Amino acid sequence: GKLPPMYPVTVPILGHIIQFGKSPLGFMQECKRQLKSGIFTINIVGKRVTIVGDPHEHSRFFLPRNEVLSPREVYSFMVPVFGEGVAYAAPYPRMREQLNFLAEELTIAKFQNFVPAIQHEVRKFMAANWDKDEGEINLLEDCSTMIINTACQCLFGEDLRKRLDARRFAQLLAKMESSLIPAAVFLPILLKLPLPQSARCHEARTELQKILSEIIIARKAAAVNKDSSTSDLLSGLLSAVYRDGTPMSLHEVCGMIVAAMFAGQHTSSITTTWSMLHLMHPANVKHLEALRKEIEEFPAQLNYNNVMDEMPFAERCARESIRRDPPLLMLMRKVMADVKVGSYVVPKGDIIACSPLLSHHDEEAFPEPRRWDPERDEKVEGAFIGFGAGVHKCIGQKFGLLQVKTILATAFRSYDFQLLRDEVPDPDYHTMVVGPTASQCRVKYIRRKA
Ligand code: HEM
Ligand SMILES: O=C(N[C@@H](Cc1c[nH]c2ccccc12)C(=O)Nc1ccncc1)c1ccc(-c2cccc(F)c2)cc1F
């Protein structure tokens, strides 16, 4: 049971961080075919990171349980945002109970009015910033706004949106996000040091909890006198009760709510943006025409069944945008026990990684991996890990693709788009969640005449 092959280090303390930083895909691709191995070890500032770049071996990463392959350590830099003691910072069963409640709230059973709520909100956007016959806009920005507005409309009741609208909420979320130092996965010390930024999320957190409390107290004042039939993500979570029979504290409720919105914000937008960029490119008229054929029968007011059931192709477009260019590049676990990966053994201490970026460009799994083709299929079973797998698979997946499909459907009905460059935009590897390079997403909308 040998250690996997490790790439020679040529920079004493830093290791491979510089090179891995400049060009992720390339670096890993070279490491792979340099060492003729899908499984291999690199070195981040002293730390050993074993990457599992062989899709046939994805199950050895996604199936071991928390006690052998743990997310706490590596995702503890998210504490300021979810809360101390919430999600990854909680006892694993408590962590698990928590995520289950969240999942219960985002299942397809709860999707009844989401689609009309999403359209109303999309149309509202389109009719205020896309209100000319032709226009230049930044599509990434604009899908981001659309995504957050639709999330809020699906997930929050009117009374909360009166106090906290999507605009306000994006700002509180940005404050929160500005204190994140993902660097601290490899330099833990940073999680314990106060920084210029540290205070910023706490201020937005306390403002957010303050609002939720006041909302709940008023909700109580009207249940004194009514059915108050409508429920939302908030009332959902407040009726949750742990196995031990105690309910969630406000701190935890709020943690789940931001964790929800935060998680979906960039990933769903980026996925929308990419899909449209691909669909509007000359080279992909074939696919744009196909999508539009799928939409052709549909009514103005879309419904649960149109987008849940009658849009296979729109889904393939979203999933393939993710496949070509996944928003999350490196997924990670801390190795609690020696564990067996293919012909190798990964020792206790290692950070173990599985990278959707790498696996989605395995030429066997995905012939011509830089070609965006919505009709392809994985040539290896399980090579698509865009939404993770096994114990920590994405729980927002369905809600996410609901937003994207409804947005594509609503957009491409009323409009055409004109990419303002020759080629589709390049990914930008220099942000924690990756998307098309923002400065390259300026785009022209054209209102359709029919
Ligand atoms: C296109 C949209 C999305 C993509 C590409 C995406 C991607 C992923 C991936 C790759 C994972 C696995 C993480 C890992 O294995 O370490 C994951 C997990 C997760 N995602 Fe998403 N996600 C999306 C949307 C959402 C949304 C809308 C939510 C919630 C509102 C959400 C909540 C989560 C949660 C809670 C997990 C936790 C898995 C766990 O630890 O049990 N995601 N997502
Ligand atoms: O790492 C980041 N975000 C993770 C968080 C995450 C990891 N495990 C998760 C499990 C559930 C939910 C969220 C996460 C994420 O979005 N993960 C996720 C997981 C599952 N589904 C969807 C999404 C992140 C890091 C830095 C920044 C940033 C941006 C601007 C300025 C700045 F200073 C920093 C933004 C980010 F967003």
Task: Say which DSSP state 215 is in.
Answer: H
Question: With contact defined as beta carbons under 8 Å apart, do 441 and 140 qualify?
Answer: yes
Sign of CA dihedral 189, 193, 195, 201: positive
Q: Angle CA(282)–CA(288)–CA(291) in degrees, nearest 5?
A: 175
Structure token digits, residue 123: 């149309």
Closest CA to 333 of 82, 98, 52: 52
Nearest ligand, CA 98: 1
344 is in an annotated binding site: no
Nearest ligand, CA 391: 1
- Distance from residue 55's CA to the centre of ligand 1 (Å): 20
Gap between the Cα atoms of 228 and 226, Å rounded: 5
Question: With contact defined as beta carbons under 8 Å apart, do 204 and 169 qualify?
Answer: no
| H or E segment to which residue 51 belongs | strand 47-52
Gap between the Cα atoms of 303 and 117, Å rounded: 10
Give the 3-state secondary structure of residue 370: coil
What lines the ligand 1 site, CB under 6 Å? Answer: 99, 106, 260, 263-264, 267-268, 271, 322, 327-328, 331, 386-388, 392, 394-397, 399-400
With a 6 Å cutoff on the Cβ, whether 433 touches ligand 2 is yes
- Distance from residue 268's CA to the centre of ligand 1 (Å): 10
Give the side-chain half-sphere CA count within 13 A for 303: 4
Instruction: Determine how many CB atoms are found less than 10 A away from the CB of residue 330.
Output: 18
- Summarize the chain as % helix, strand, coil (round to 5): 50, 10, 35
Structure token digits, residue 283: 């080279």
Q: Dihedral through CA 312, CA 316, CA 318, CA 324, nearest 10?
A: 180
Closest CA to 204 of 171, 180, 181: 171
430 is in an annotated binding site: no
Structure token digits, residue 112: 């009844």
- Distance from residue 393's CA to the centre of ligand 1 (Å): 7
Closest CA to 29 of 366, 336, 439, 260: 366
Full set of structural domains in the chain with CATH: 1-450 (1.10.630.10)
Structure token digits, residue 87: 């999600």
Residues contacting residue 341 through CB under 8 Å, at least 6 positions apart: 4, 39, 50, 52, 57, 60, 61, 352
Residues contacting residue 53 through CB under 8 Å, at least 6 positions apart: 28, 32, 38, 39, 40, 355, 358, 359, 362
Gap between the Cα atoms of 279 and 417, Å rounded: 9
Q: State which approach was used to obtain the coordinates.
A: X-ray
Residues contacting residue 77 through CB under 8 Å, at least 6 positions apart: 180, 181, 182, 183, 184, 185, 190, 191
- Distance from residue 327's CA to the centre of ligand 2 (Å): 10
The ligand 1 atom nearest the CA atom of 328:
10
Whose Cα sits closest to atom 35 in ligand 1? 395
With a 6 Å cutoff on the Cβ, whether 75 touches ligand 2 is yes
Find residue 134's DSSP bridge partners. 446
With a 6 Å cutoff on the Cβ, whether 173 touches ligand 2 is no
Gap between the Cα atoms of 172 and 178, Å rounded: 10
Q: What type of residue is 333? A: R
Closest CA to 232 of 287, 165, 160, 305: 160
Gap between the Cα atoms of 391 and 61, Å rounded: 10
Sign of CA dihedral 117, 122, 128, 133: negative
